[PDB]
Every structure is written in C-alpha cells, then in structure tokens.
C-alpha cells in the first residue's frame, strides 16, 4: 500500500506554554498567576525553581523566532498568559500584555511562520482564585469569555488556528484530586464541580468564537493516553473499556458531544461525585462544536481488572480498572512507555468516535541532554523518538485521519512544572540549569537539523 | 457495589423465525420463498432437511402460545414471511397469510404476552430473486417497503416493539461472500452493493415506521461478535481497532448515525469494492434513527495482527487483522466460544457509542438433548449457559445500560438453516428429527421450568 504524503498545509510545528518559558514574572503590569504563588510554597518545586525568568523568552523572543525561521517552522503553539492581559483575571485589561503578543504575533507573521495561541495553560490569575476559588466558579465562566473575546478581537485578523484549555483533564486532575497543582486540593467531588465548570468555560469561548472569528479554527486540547487491555481475558477487556471511558471520553465526549458517558457519570452518581448541573448547560455543551480535536500525546496505558478490594506502581479504581505495565512496548528512562504505534490507535479512535480532524498540539522526549564542547548536544534520542511518531501520523493519514498538523514538544528546553529543568525537550538547548539561568543562551540541539530537514521535505523521506 | 434489579417491564422473551419454525411451505396460497428453493438443492442442508413442515408452527401455534403462557413469557419475537403475505414480493396482498399472523397476534394478546415482530429474516419471496435479483436491485427497496408499510397498517394498533432486518450481516455475508446461504454467491464487490440496498431498505422502512406506528419502538438486530484483541502488542490493539470498525462499525455505524466509518470506507475504496452511492442516499440513511439496536449475540472474536501476505481456522484481511483462538474463553461441544462477559462488553460498547436501548433478541445454546422416559428432557447445560448470560445482563444495567428485554433462542425447537434438527435451542423439546416427523409432540425442557422461575421472580432468582 502506498503511503499519502503529509497534505501541502500540513502545520510542522513546535511548542510551548507561558509560564515554562516567558518568566517577566512581575514586569509590565502582569499580575500573579496561581503558578506564581504555588511554586514559591517551600518544598513544592524541585530546588525551589519556579517561573521567574525560566528561560526569559518574553525578553528573548526575537531571537527565538530567529532560530524558528531558521528551522523554517510552518506553526508555532504558544500560550498566552492571561495574568498579563487582565492582572486580577476581570477588571481592566493591560495594554503591555497584549502588545507582548501582538510583537510576538508579529514576528512569526514576518517570518512566514502561523501562530497557534493557547488561550489556557494553567495559570488562572491569583485574584480569581483569591475571589471565589476560579474553576469552582460559575463565575469563571464569564471572565475567561471575557478575556478570551479580547484575544479574539485583538488577534483574530492575525490567527487562524486557536487551542482553548490545554489539557484540561491535567490542570483538573492534578490541582483537584492529586493535589500536585494549584490549588493542591485532594477531594474528587471539588475536582469534578471544577471539572464541569471549565467544561461550560470552553463551550462559552467556542461560541464566542464564532462570533468574532468567522474563518477561524478553534478546539480543546485533550492530554490522551489510549488505553489498551492487557490481552484477551474478557474481564481485561471490560477493564479496558471502563478505563478508555472513564480516562478518556469523559473529556473527549463532551468536547465532541456536550455528553458525558452514561456509565461513567452513573459510577460518579453512586459514589456522590457528579457534577452540579444547571438549567442550559446540556444546551450550551451540546451546541459548541470545535473544528478540531487537540491531541498531546506521550504514551498508551495498559490495564487489566482491579476487583473491588483492588488497587486505589499501579494506579486505578477499585471495580473498574488497574494499570499494569505493557510487555510489548520499549521504556524511557523514567518508566514511561514509548508507544508510536499507540498515537497512530489514538488518532484511529478519534475518527472513528467523533470523525474530526486532529491537531497534534504536543509530542516529544524528555531526556538529560549534555553539552559536549563546541557547543554540541547530540540527541539521536529525541531524533529516532520524533521519527517514529511522525512516521506512524503519516500512517494514519493513509488510513483516512485528517490530522492538521504536528506540534513538537518543546522548541526551545523550558521549565518543568515541579521537576527543574534537566530533563530537556528542546529542539534548542538553553544554557541554564536548576541552580542558576547561566547566560541562558539558545544552542542548536542535533534535532534541530533533523526536523529542519523534516520540514524543508514535508515528511517525503522518513 | 451491589446489582441493580431488571426493571419492571423488562421483556422476558424467547424467540424464533418464520422458516425455521412454521413449515405449511405451500399452503394459503404463500409463495416461494428463496429458502424453500435454495433448501432443495440436493446436498444444500444436512440429510436433505427443508422447511416444508419444520416444527409445523404454522398448525400448531395455539399449543405453542398455550405453552408461552404457561411458561409467563412477557414476550415473544417472531418473524413474518414476506412470501405469505406477497406470495410474488410485489403484487397482490395475501389476506390469508396476514390472517394467520393476526391469529398468532391475537392469541399473544389474548394471554398477555406482547409480540416483537421481525419484519425479515432471510426469506424475501423468490419471485424477486428472478425478477431484479433481490437485494442486488434499489427496486426492493420500495417492495420491501411496501411489504413493511402493509404489516404496520394491520397489526400497528397491536405490536409495540418492531424489528426490521434480523442479522443484516449474517443474510448479507453469507449469502454473498461465503455463498453458504441463497444467493449462493462469492464476490465482495456484489455482497456491498447488496448491503448497501438493504442499509436503504431498513431506513426507508422506519421512515415508513414514524407515520404509521406512531407510538411504536423499531430498530434493526445485528449480529454482534464484539472484538477483542489478543495483547497488549500496539499491532494487535491496531488489528482490534480494524477488526471492530470494518466488522461491527461497518453496521451499526449506518444503522445509529447513517454513516459508513471512515478507515474501512478508504480501504474497501482502495479495493474497488464500495457499494455505488445516489443522490440522496446519506439523507436518507441518517433521517433514520432507531429506538434501539438490536443485538443477536453468541460469542466475541479475538484477532491479532496480520501482515500484507497473510490470512484472507484463522480469517480475515491482509494487513488489517486475522481472527486468532481466544485461549481465555470455554467452548461448547462444536468448538464455539462460550464467553457471557463478552454480552456485557458489548451492550457497554452500545450504549458507549450510541446511547441507545437494547434489546437482546437472540441469545441461547444449541446442544444435543436426550428424551428420557416420562418425557423429561434435563438440560441444565442450557440453565447454565443461559444463567451465566443472564447475570451479565444484570451487570450491563448496573453498569447503566438501558436493557428492554433477552430474547432467548429458541422458545421450541426448531429447523436449522443447513444443519437440520439434533442441534436444538428450545425450552420446548419438539419430538422430531431428521428422518422423520415422528408426533411432532411439544415437550417441556427442564430450562422452561427455570426460565418460568427467573420471569416470576423478574431476574432475581437466577
């Protein structure tokens, strides 16, 4: 079988998220965000290290997006830090704010490069959860339509292609249920009220969207781990499909749907966990349909049957599932499952349940990268971990999945949300470390060249 | 985690199909059906046995009703012959073939009992074989219609619960692509066209539905073998992935969101071998939602990954999956799978992809049965099997399945399509076999005694 080549506006990307890079904590009138407090609470952070001046692209982004145009980048993803356009979440917006991005804007446009803003990764400002808690709200709802309409007045001549929450399950999941994120609460019942909330905040931005961005193309981004069963036992399988439900389409569904699946909210209803539902949230769900569906992709998950005295290392929920570690896949160094032929199965499944294009928003490896003299990083790593995962993309374009492009996780290394900085994603190495930013100065990682030529051949030779 | 009860209508039901149970072939003027022909054929079926008498339902039908009363069955699902009520397929109604069909109907509402009536199993009337080729032709879409529209106009007022095409992919497949039943043909090209026809005829048919029938719920009955793959191999969760679409999806797909998927379309587009699409057909095939799918179940198919030069003992397609032995389920005494979480596994993924009800309408296990003295007939292999399916069921509701009513196959014994009578399915025992008609005696099986408890007690006491 032939193999179709990557479609001629297929969008090579690379990315980002605001507070990993921009640092400019504090300057130009930006106001805190919830990242800014929590990662100053003594022991949250490792090293104490924190957002900053991370890697200073607010004050670097020129010759950041030298090095993209000299990669010859078709996209750039990037997030916008909404404590820099409206400091206290509400109330008056900041001009220097949003002039950072439209000079940003400016010069991916000038470089040929399409942007791709993020209006939300994970840094609601302070004074909203200061207020009223910002996802346990109702009245989040508003203000991010608010400042989202903003963004879209402002950029929406300039922005074709729009992500809204990115990787809401992570952002929910972590700050509700793990208490690893802000705002470090462990309750389930908290996590899926938050958790409804911000499903209502991004139907209201899609909708809003279409007002203000006629051409446009706007969706969630949806942090996917496709489950498989761990062989053919029938209660594995039952297993697989309570895991693929609850993990999964309890997102995906309502992204593409406005509907969360019935056996999952009926657990949710016997444990006393569903969600408060208020008249014209079904009809506000079910009537923001996104062009596309957002995928950031690391790993598959295996699992097998959890008895009900089961597992609560293995994770899971006694009744349904238990994840167990995968024979048959490869392993990075921290455990992680190397799955290529897994995003491919990911990609299949969204077609097939939701029959949307997808857009690739994040992908890549983390690894601890050493700067050899000369100023030489090689990581034939990250190279054979990229090529295999765009090979298999272009599998699954072959099967029939329209996929709008592929984000490369990260452009430059950036800081880790609680882990410092020395497991690297980068095309371009940074010269800084968890003890100080060095000179921070930007070196070309051996994949840099190979994604150039990537690029410069749309895919042609892999 | 304690189960939830049947709910209080829950359609207890047992089943059958017209050729398989009524015999009187040729008389009331009924026309000849393409099994009554294809059945001749020497060497066709098992010691050359036919419908011409079957278990003579057709004479017997009040002893048999009298039966189902006494057993407290809430529901019985038969099939009407096309061929008794247009004896050429088009034409000129038959008055005494529905009148035979409204004395089964009245003698069902006389005891209480509520009639599923199944618009075709298998049985369209020979004369639209030699006119246009059946199913091959658009031309038995409107006569089908026709047929469908009359039933509704005589027995609407009476039958609440409809059934289009029984086993669509059954009568498809194998009277196309394995030639086993009439036409007797072995060419995929022709067996999409003809699928395609038929996906026409069943929407046209519950169009029809929605006029005349009001108050009525309908839907088509797909022969159900929920995939699953081998491992946890990423290529063998792919080969799943294949398997279920091109398999299952390639049905169900049409018949809940009038569309093929896409994956398998591309590739049966790659072959050549996509039925011929005409204006209006997608319209047609999405205004036509049922109220619930129908599900015949007998076991689940474990695949695994098949290479381009592979499998087309094992089946399947190259490059896409091949059907591998599932060493984690029983078998019966024919070397069939035995696999009731399976049945739970499938009525999830219904209600996971399409939100619809489910009614179990055929479900059972065919063993040989020994008459003892006294007329016992002690088959607690078929208590154990229907039981086990039975609890499944039970978890599905739990789980938040909307489960109408279990079929069970068959309520007496009967006529098998190619393997005559020794294998038998019924809660009644007909004393008959394949070399004669002997008395033609209904016998009570040990499993009517215990399928009477489960109905009296509505599932509780299993």
Known sequence: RHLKPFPPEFLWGAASAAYQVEGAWNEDGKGLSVWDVFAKQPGRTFKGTNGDVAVDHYHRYQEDVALMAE????????????????????????????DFYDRLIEELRNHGIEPIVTLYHWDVPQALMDAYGAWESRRIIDDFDRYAVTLFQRFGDRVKYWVTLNQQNIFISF?????????????????????????????????????????????????????????????????????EEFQNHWWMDVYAWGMYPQAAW??????????????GDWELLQAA????????????????????????????????????????????????????VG??????????????????????????????????????????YLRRHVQEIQRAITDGVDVLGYCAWSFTDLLSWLNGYQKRYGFVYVNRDDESEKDLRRIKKKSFYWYQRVIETNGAEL
């Open 289 to 340: 349909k996104p062009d596309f569906m957002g995928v950031n992709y690391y790993q598959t998950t295996t699992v097998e049957h959890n008895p009900p005295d089961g597992v609560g290392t293995s994770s899971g929920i006694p009744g349904l599932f238990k994840t167990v570690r995968n024979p048959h896949v490869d392993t990075t160094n921290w455990d992680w499952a190397i799955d290529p």
């Open 343 to 384: 995003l491919r199965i990911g990609l299949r499944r969204i077609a097939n349940r939701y029959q949307l294009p997808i857009l690739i928003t994040e992908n890549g490896l983390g690894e601890f990268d050493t700067l050899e003299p000369g100023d030489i990083v090689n990581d034939d790593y990250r190279i054979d």
């Open 71 to 98: 990669m010859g980048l078709k996209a750039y993803r990037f997030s916008v830090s909404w404590s820099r356009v409206f400091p206290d979440g509400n109330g008056a917006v900041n001009e220097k704010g949003l």
């Open 175 to 243: 700050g509700y249920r793990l208490g690893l994120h802000p705002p470090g609460v462990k309750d389930m019942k908290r996590m899926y009220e938050a958790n409804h909330i911000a499903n209502l905040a991004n139907a209201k931005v899609i909708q809003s969207f279409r007002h203000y961005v006629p051409d446009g193309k706007i969706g969630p981004s949806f942090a996917y781990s496709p489950m498989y069963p761990y062989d053919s036992r029938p209660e594995n399988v039952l297993a697989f499909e309570n895991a």
């Open 266 to 279: 009926n657990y949710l209803e016997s444990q006393g966990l569903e969600p408060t539902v208020a008249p």
